[PDB]
Amino acid sequence: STGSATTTPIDSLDDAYITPVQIGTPAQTLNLDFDTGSSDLWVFSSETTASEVDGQTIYTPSKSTTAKLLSGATWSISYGDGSSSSGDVYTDTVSVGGLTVTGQAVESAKKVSSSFTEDSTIDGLLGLAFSTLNTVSPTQQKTFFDNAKASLDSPVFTADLGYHAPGTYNFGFIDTTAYTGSITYTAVSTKQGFWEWTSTGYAVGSGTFKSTSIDGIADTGTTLLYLPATVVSAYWAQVSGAKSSSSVGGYVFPCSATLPSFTFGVGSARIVIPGDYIDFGPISTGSSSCFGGIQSSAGIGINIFGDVALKAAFVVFNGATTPTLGFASK
């Protein structure tokens, strides 16, 4: 089997991407944030504290003839950005782009933090990291991909995120029309439960490539590119007037600037992030200070190849017995 679904930016900055997902019988369609940095499929629901729902579409398990309470199971997750959610668990039928999993754990939120409430466009998350990170207790549950894998034509999914435009998540096949040149594959460590890999270096604008190993995670659920302070300083030094602002929470730059590109290495291959992808716009409405899309990972504890990086590539998440990651230009 295969599946193919369009993923759409939630706003004009590409802060996140939503993908429609069918849950239950008859189908209830919710728009979920596909997150290769976590491993829980959780939804706003009829059980979510009413004051914490503001415009989201909810899953109502009592209206699904295939929903079953997973008795005794609870979940609770905290994300890198400080947000969180928790609740109980149902199993139900879940379909993405024509690919159906029966008996998928659907984690129903009883509580969500303010960041989730305040984002009316995201109805929940669909985790695509390794199932070892799943938070369901006392019986850990599998991700949608893990459940689907054996049925797939090939044990892969691909992320093809757009810049200010829709893109695609495919399951079970590699669309050879969706990228240019060849796909370069690179090793993955699953030791921390992430799609963790080592970039071979970077360049800023038309500058020379610096060969240096940068360990980090491919994370569709993180907006920006978070890299070591040395790398980030080298980038922003090429933008007149750019500075790190403790008050704003990272690097800012004059909105009048033209940003240089940023290149990262995948083996001997190179992925180029155009400068415009690094512009996250005014820090507040009407400001002439703009927020940068490359930020320091210092104090996160890990480097994160988030959407800024991934949307410059066609990315293969290869879930074969020994997982790997593939990157192509597009």
- Alpha carbon of 193 to those of 39, 133, 301: distances in Å? 9, 6, 15
User: If you ran DSSP here, which 8-state letter would residue 181 be given?
Assistant: S
Q: What is the CATH number of the domain that holds 282?
A: 2.40.70.10
Same structural domain, 206 and 235: yes
User: How many whole angstroms separate alpha carbon 242 and alpha carbon 232?
Assistant: 11
Nearest to 121 by CA among 260, 248, 207, 12: 12
Indicate if 146 belongs to the active site: no
Whether omega for the bond prior to residue 166 falls within 30 degrees of 0, making it cis, is no
Residues contacting 330, CB < 8 A, separation 6+: 160, 178, 179, 180, 313, 314
Same structural domain, 211 and 290: yes
Q: Edge-to-edge, what's the strand order for the sheet holding 294-296?
A: 269-273, 262-266, 196-204, 210-218, 303-305, 225-227, 294-296
Q: Pick from 104, 139, 174: which residue ends a domain?
A: 174
Q: Is the dihedral of CA 189, 191, 4, 32 positive or negative?
A: negative
- Cβ–Cβ < 8 Å for 40, 77: yes
Same structural domain, 152 and 180: no
Which domain range does residue 191 map to?
A: 175-330
Same structural domain, 140 and 19: yes
- Cβ–Cβ < 8 Å for 16, 9: yes
User: How many whole angstroms separate alpha carbon 29 and alpha carbon 63?
Assistant: 13
Give the resolution to one decimal, in Å. Answer: 1.2
Residue 273 half-sphere exposure, CB side, CA atoms within 13 Å?
25
Look up residue 79 and give its two tokens. Answer: 């994300």
* Angle (nearest 5°) at CA 32 between 156 and 263: 60
Indicate if 199 belongs to the active site: yes
User: If you ran DSSP here, which 8-state letter would residue 63 be given?
Assistant: G
Residues contacting 17, CB < 8 A, separation 6+: 7, 8, 9, 10, 33, 34, 161, 167, 220, 307
DSSP 120-149: TT--EEEE-S-GGG---BSS----HHHHHG
User: How many whole angstroms separate alpha carbon 32 and alpha carbon 37?
Assistant: 14
- Alpha carbon of 128 to those of 121, 159, 203, 221: distances in Å? 20, 11, 29, 10
Collapse the DSSP code of 184 into the 3-class scheme (helix H, G, I; strand E, B; otherwise coil) and give the result: strand
Look up residue 122 and give its two tokens. Answer: 């995201």
Catalytic residue among 14, 33, 35, 88: 35
Same structural domain, 186 and 307: yes
Q: Exposure string (b/e) for 295-307, b if CB count within 10 Å is 16 or more?
A: bbbeeeeebbbbb
Same structural domain, 149 and 38: yes
Q: How many independent structural domains does the chain possess?
A: 2
Same structural domain, 119 and 65: yes
Catalytic residue among 38, 199, 296, 297: 199
Same structural domain, 112 and 80: yes
Q: Pick from 120, 146, 174: which residue ends a domain?
A: 174
Q: Pick from 150, 174, 198: which residue ends a domain?
A: 174
Same structural domain, 310 and 253: yes
Same structural domain, 159 and 242: no
Same structural domain, 102 and 180: no
How do strand 99-112 and strand 41-43 relate by DSSP bridges? Answer: parallel
- Alpha carbon of 57 to those of 4, 31, 43: distances in Å? 22, 8, 9
Same structural domain, 102 and 212: no
User: How many whole angstroms separate alpha carbon 223 and alpha carbon 226?
Assistant: 9
Burial of 170 (0-12, 13-18, 19+ CB in 10 A): buried
